[PDB]
Amino acid sequence: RICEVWACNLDEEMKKIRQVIRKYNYVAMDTEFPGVVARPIGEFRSNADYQYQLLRCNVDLLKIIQLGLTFMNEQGEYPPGTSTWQFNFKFNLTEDMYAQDSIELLTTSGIQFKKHEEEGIETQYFAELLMTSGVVLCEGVKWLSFHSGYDFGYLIKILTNSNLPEEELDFFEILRLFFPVIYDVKYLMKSCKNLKGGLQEVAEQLELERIGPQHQAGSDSLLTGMAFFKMREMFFEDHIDDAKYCGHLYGL
């Protein structure tokens, strides 16, 4: 179900994804990064601006550690065989910046940093693959996520290969170009009176079948996708109002 992806097999798997996404345009995703380590400097126009500047100063300094993508169709069905891909990126605990607790939490979750440091994927190359595979831009994709501000922040950083836009509004303009359609499940949960908490708590409340290392990108993306479709029929009349939910990331 979940295909571990490293450098040695990046091209092989992206090629498959290049095809799977044609029939399974709904892709749920999650990431794993080295926590939050910095504090914003300067003035802030509002609470939204402060949250964005907080995200910016951290996204610009850290390196993504893991990306999880689960593909599904309009009816919430998975492609035959492998439905989820977990990309492991190159990270060096001796060179790279990070938050102590986050690394320890990830170690306990199963992340093998040693292998990330030796066989991890190069974001620069992954960026190019994302673009040349029709998963990232203005096509007809539906991105499903959970408490995703940082998740998309890291992706935007990779895809543009530069620091995030200084202004919050500019970041969202760019976000729209690469991910025109995004549904953040945690944001949607604010409209569901009986749903609260993080992914694991929502899975419990929705009685979803958890698959794999319950604390990694791939595993989480699976739950997100399952949560989205169930919630989309249960609390939303089979159709999410874009005016109110599309492109809105929890927190930002």
Add this chain to the structure above:
Amino acid sequence: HMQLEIQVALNFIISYLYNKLPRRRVNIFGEELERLLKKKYEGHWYPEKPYKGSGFRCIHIGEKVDPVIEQASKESGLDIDDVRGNLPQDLSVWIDPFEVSYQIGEKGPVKVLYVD
């Protein structure tokens, strides 16, 4: 039918606006909102399964304001910032069959306004 539930929700929301904004505009806001909500909820009200369509029907007023509130607000000559300004921060109102409840703040408890 759903009339009662909608008015419970409306009277609650409107109670914060009176004596804070022009009486006539608040009245229009109230009346227009009822109309918009009744229109929006038709075909999405299941007294058999009240939870069904809860999210679709949820009315939120926070950083982002529900379009129906913006529409009612515009059609009544009320500045959206004035409406959000006199209501509790991040107010969420659920209007379901036989049950109207709300939540002041993202972490606040869900309180019941009307139930059967």
